[PDB]
Amino acid sequence: GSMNLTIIGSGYVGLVTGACLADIGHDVFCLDVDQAKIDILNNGGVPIHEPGLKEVIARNRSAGRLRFSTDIEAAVAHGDVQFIAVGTPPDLQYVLAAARNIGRYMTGFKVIVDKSTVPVGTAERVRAAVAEELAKRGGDQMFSVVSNPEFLKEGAAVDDFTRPDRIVIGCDDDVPGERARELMKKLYAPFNRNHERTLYMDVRSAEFTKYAANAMLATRISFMNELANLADRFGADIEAVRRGIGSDPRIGYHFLYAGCGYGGSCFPKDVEALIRTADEHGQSLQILKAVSSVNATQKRVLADKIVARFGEDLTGRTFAIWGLAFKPNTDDMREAPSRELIAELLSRGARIAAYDPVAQEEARRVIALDLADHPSWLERLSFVDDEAQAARDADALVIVTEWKIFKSPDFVALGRLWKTPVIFDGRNLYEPETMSEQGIEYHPIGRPGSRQAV
């Protein structure tokens, strides 16, 4: 039943993977070279915004199934299966360094699992690195490198790990590959007690799958954003079109919400990576280039509409911003559309009052960096603790991230605060007709505006 596992990288993917595998009964050693992070974890803290994770870590540490250490040798000796879950910042040196440490110390068969999102062909480089360490030692030790990508969503990662749609395992079919596949089967057995959730394939195809999946999700979004722009010209309603096409089971209903673009640390990075490596291989990915181009423009749509409505010089104007994080339920600001919007508005002289239920501190940090070259613009940026207060004296309210708290606001209270009842909605939260009936000039994406907007 229970196996000795090591997770390399105490980051987000690594922590959730390690904690949840400990939670099904495996004995897990989480390695990170950063003593500070390890210290934080061993003092019962959690460096990430991840519901349920602290309590999973806590109960498994107490049960003796989860340990946090910087001790590389102890990590190699512990784990029969070694998950490489280290970052790949804008660079594979860390996954390759992890691989070399396994090769330099291992004394028996190892399954090395590439769990971090890595380019196709990485498993072969990991294999070469481990092999060369073994050749220095003269040892006969055998091993196999497996690709097992992550499909977690920030802020929902514990549930996504615990009830996955599928588990993708790319393995070789030679003798060590089959030995590794058997160990992976045993490792994930508790997830396969009902429907089979594991999908086995070759290593290169598993590596490609992760990029292809995110690329298709991004493609759905940019597809709808281009059609939203066309709906405006046609006098059509993209939300009606969304239900109209999503109701074909071959299309499906999810990931078709037009709005102010996709952000995060996944889609832009994985789409761009796939475009770049295809180009390096002599192929221009026409659809993915278009998807990326559409998204770049779409992240400017809110400010463009604001300029169309109010003029190029926004000095003397105030805008309330609802939503900062790149999506609901996280404090993550990476590639957040709010950052592009706020920079654009500040550059034109506007004042900005911003609200987000959880992301205020991170937004303050990163926007101060974004606009470090314009300290005077930052003097016009404030953050408020209550959503309605952002609207005080505002010429318009701008919705960027569809946090639930924004879905049924107190428009009466808003009416007593704002200068003019104007809403630009990058996430289509409200019915236009309802906004009309409430005296709000409503500017959604791809839908007829309220009558005041027209």
Ligand X SMILES: O=C(O)[C@H]1O[C@H](OP(=O)(O)OP(=O)(O)OC[C@H]2O[C@@H](n3ccc(=O)[nH]c3=O)[C@H](O)[C@@H]2O)[C@H](O)[C@@H](O)[C@@H]1O
194 lies in the binding site for its own copies (CB under 8 A): no
Give the one residue of 266, 303, 346, 396 binding ligand X; rule: CB under 6 A.
266
315 appears as a binding residue in the annotation: no
Assess whether 266 carries a catalytic annotation: yes
Q: Which is nearer to ligand X, 49 or 327 (CB)?
A: 327
CB of 422 to ligand X, least distance (A): 23
266 appears as a binding residue in the annotation: yes
Q: Which is nearer to ligand X, 259 or 432 (CB)?
A: 259
435 lies in the binding site for its own copies (CB under 8 A): no
193 appears as a binding residue in the annotation: no
Active-site entry in 20, 30, 171, 266: 266
Please list every residue from 190 through 229 that binds ligand X, using CB under 6 A: 214, 217, 221
Please list every residue from 135 through 174 that binds ligand X, using CB under 6 A: 150-154
Pairwise CA distance, residues 254 & 327, whole Å: 15
305 appears as a binding residue in the annotation: no
Q: Which is nearer to its own copies, 138 or 249 (CB)?
A: 249
427 appears as a binding residue in the annotation: yes
Please list every residue from 263 through 292 that binds its own copies, using CB under 8 A: 274, 278, 281-283, 285-291
The region of 40-48, 74-82, 232-240, 414-422 touching its own copies under the rule CB under 8 A is 232-240
How many of the chain's residues bind its own copies (CB under 8 A)? 61
| Residue 224, Cβ density class (10 Å: 0-12 exposed, 13-18 middle, ≥19 buried) | buried
Give which of its own copies, ligand X, none residue 23 binds (C-beta under 5 to 8 Å, depending on kind): none
Give which of ligand X, its own copies, none residue 285 binds (C-beta under 5 to 8 Å, depending on kind): its own copies
Query: In Å, how far are 55, 357, 361, 414 from 380, measured between CA atoms?
Result: 40, 21, 17, 21
Residues in Cβ contact with 261 at an 8 Å cutoff, skipping those fewer than 6 apart: 221, 225, 295, 298, 299, 301, 337
Give which of ligand X, its own copies, none residue 404 binds (C-beta under 5 to 8 Å, depending on kind): none
Which residues participate in the annotated binding site for substrate?
151-154, 210, 255-259, 263, 327
By CB under 6 A, name the binding residues for ligand X: 150-154, 214, 217, 221, 255-257, 259, 262-264, 266-267, 326-327
Which are the catalytic amino acids?
A: 266
Binding residues for NAD(+): 32, 37, 88, 117, 154, 269, 334
